[PDB]
Structure 1
């Protein structure tokens, strides 16, 4: 069989399932590296013994066993990297998919909040609906930027083939949010009191979730 992780269906707690699967993978990997490193040790002690006894046959053993070892390592290193990338692609797909859903639904509550307003003062509801939408888009930025961060440290290469993309995402997020704020222009009664609150909340919420940094670049 495979990991139970790949066939889930609520995705509601993806972070926890992923973080969990990642340990089961990470740990399973540590199981193998230990087994190899131990094999190396037994192999290596042997060389030290037959060192002065069979210096010719002994030495051949060292060259030989290095090739094997070197190879077995590279083999493992790849497998892990392969599996790691398989679990992430999946993860990043559900997270994006699930984030989108929040956007999708947060918008609905928003546009209803506004339609209901036309008739009667959905005042407070409109805002809490907007702030919800904002939290959703901003969470999309925070996770994206963060992915660029991990890739900047893992693959300074894979990383570069993402920047144009990251820049494209962060742009439309701002656009979508600004366009979603524009929808208030029509309710003058309401754009006068709700807007300045929601914009401050956007600047505030972004300051908390995805700050600035001074350490490095």
Structure 2
């Protein structure tokens, strides 16, 4: 069989299921490395023994066994890398889907909040609705940046083939958020009191979730 992680369907707790699958994977990998490193140990002790006894036969043994070991290592390193990517592509796919959903639904509650306002003062609801939409888009930003961060340390390369993409996502998030704020322009009554609140919230919310950093670049 495969891991139960790949056929889940609520995705509501993707962070946890993933974090957990990753440990099961990470640990299974550690089990194998240990087994090999132990094999290396028994193999190596044997070389130390036959060193002086069969110097000739012994040395051939060392050369041979390195080849094996070198190869076995690489073999493992590849697999863990192959399996790691598969689990990430999936994860990133769910997370993006989950994030979009929130955007989708945060928007609905928003527009309704507005339509309901045309008639009677949905005042507060409009705002709580907007802030939700903002949180949503900003969560998207945070994750994207973070992905660029991990990739910058994992593969300095993969990161470069992502930068153009990151700058493109971050641009449209701003655009969508501004566009969404523009929707208030028609409710003058409301754009005067809700806007300055949502805008600060946006600056405040971004400051908390995805700051700046000074350590390195």
Q: Which TM-score band (shorter chain)?
A: over 0.9
Rounded to whole Å, the distance in 2 between the matches of 1:56 and 1:157 is 45
Rounded to whole Å, the distance in 2 between the matches of 1:178 and 1:149 is 26
Normalising by the residue count of structure 2, what TM-score does the alignment of the two structures yield? 1.00
In the TM superposition, residue 96 of structure 1 has moved relative to its aligned partner by: 0.1
Per-residue displacement from partner, 1:113-139 (whole Å, max 9, x unpaired)?
Answer: 000000000000000000000000000
Structure 1: runs of 5 or more not aligned? none
Per-residue displacement from partner, 1:35-75 (whole Å, max 9, x unpaired)?
Answer: 00000000000000000000000000000000000000000
- For the residue of structure 2 that corresponds to 1:208, the secondary structure is helix
In the TM superposition, residue 186 of structure 1 has moved relative to its aligned partner by: 0.1
Per-residue displacement from partner, 1:167-189 (whole Å, max 9, x unpaired)?
Answer: 00000000000000000000000
Normalising by the residue count of structure 1, what TM-score does the alignment of the two structures yield? 1.00
Rounded to whole Å, the distance in 1 between the matches of 2:109 and 2:158 is 38
Per-residue displacement from partner, 1:9-48 (whole Å, max 9, x unpaired)?
Answer: 0000000000000000000000000000000000000000
> Partner residue of 2:89?
89
Structure 2: runs of 5 or more not aligned? none
Rounded to whole Å, the distance in 2 between the matches of 1:177 and 1:159 is 26
Q: Tell me which stretches of 4 or more aligned residues in structure 1 moved more than 4 Å.
A: none
- For the residue of structure 2 that corresponds to 1:212, the secondary structure is coil
Rounded to whole Å, the distance in 1 between the matches of 2:205 and 2:76 is 43
State the aligned residue count.
217
Rounded to whole Å, the distance in 2 between the matches of 1:97 and 1:125 is 26
Per-residue displacement from partner, 1:125-154 (whole Å, max 9, x unpaired)?
Answer: 000000000000000000000000000000
